[PDB]
């Protein structure tokens, strides 16, 4: 072997979040309950703590878990293969950046794609962010992604947001300042992992097809299960809870107070 | 210590 | 302090219809005790706490209420009484459910209600015959007399989930659905409540910076 990272910059990213660190969310993320998902769309999830039931906002938490991992794990990361046997399977990042219509020339995804490209060694030595060139050297059209780090045993992300991850490398990271640039990247593999908005679908609407129904059904129950089997025992074991975070932390109800209404028979 | 990546 | 009590019961009647129940879906098990459910109709959203033992029960009750025939006991010798009042025992069988069976001023009582754990009298047919004067409208056909009626309570009240079960996400969908089946199932037999609004989702604006650009 496990490579020790040496480098200043992670350094001082990890104390940042040292010195961010909430003592009393910690704790009720520590000692969670977990209840059940609210909102698969506003990704909403339901937890007890002691006394009080909460409401969170997993997107909010799953960034600053997937972002602590990074931090943690930088350059000693596991690879998701992203490669089958299907040629046709194949991740083009030129093909994912076309997703994106103010992109409207070749020429401005290509500006993107060349970025990500010259620093492929360091985003494969320190990230497991594995990029390769099917044809000749310099064909930008045919630059693909080839692996992702591991962050978590059990958790593959969803790949809905490839084409925000790819424009967001190319456009958003500030590849010029070492700290920044590391900030960053990191920042980007964290927004790909948490999981999907799943927009909610009305299983009433007789208007709306069968196969739309089962397949919104399936996306609710992989969630859910993502959630209860890996997400929060995760949350639980090794979440530190940034205090920007406060406002993602709502309490709903208290059994003092409901035990004051609902009582034996 | 710095990136040999970052010059 | 009742107050807080009223305006709950009050909120539901107005805020949750029979088909709400239907649409409604569970989160989860709230501290062994609490189903916590959302209910998005229209534009409108909100979450709810059931109580498991208590809605179970409701359910269970109504369900005795309406369906059970009382044993009784065929008399030896048949008793007469004298009403008015004697309209409302010549239309309703709510009797022949009650234990009561009768031969049509001129009433026979030919069966009275029997049970291992109370005596049952004339007191009580005409406890019968006052519940129905006063009921007021509604549904007349699961009408019972306050003796019956607590042995259904306790019946129901044994049968029941209990607080501290676990329960399925199966079992908890079945229990909130159920109550829409029943006509303002907002309390259980004892006059404990079944459910409440928790709050209402409308205005929160969750982490989207990973589809930002
Ligand atoms: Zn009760
Ligand atoms: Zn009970």
Redesign the interface.
Known sequence: ERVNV????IKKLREKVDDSIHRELTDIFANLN??????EE???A?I?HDLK?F?I?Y??VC?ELFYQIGLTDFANFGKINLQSTNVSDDIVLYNLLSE?DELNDDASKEKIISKIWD?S??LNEYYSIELVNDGLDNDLKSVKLKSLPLLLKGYIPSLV?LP?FI??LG?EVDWE??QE??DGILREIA??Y?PD?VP?VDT?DASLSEDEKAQFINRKEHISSLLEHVLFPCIKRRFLAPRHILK?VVE??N?PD?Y?????? | VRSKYFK | ELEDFEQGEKYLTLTVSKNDFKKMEVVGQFNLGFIIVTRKVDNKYDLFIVDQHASDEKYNFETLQAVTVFKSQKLIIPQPVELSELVVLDNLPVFEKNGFKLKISRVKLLSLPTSKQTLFDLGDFNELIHLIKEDGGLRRDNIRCSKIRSMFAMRACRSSIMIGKPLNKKTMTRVVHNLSELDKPWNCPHGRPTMRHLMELRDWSSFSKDYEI
């Open positions: 040496n480098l200043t910059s977990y209840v059940g998902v609210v909102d506003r990704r909403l339901a007890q039931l409401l906002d997107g909010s960034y994106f620093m060694s360091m947001k925000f424009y967001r456009k300042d070492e640039c590391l927004l790909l948490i908005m909610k009433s993602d709903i109800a059994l409901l004051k209404v609902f009582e034996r028979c």
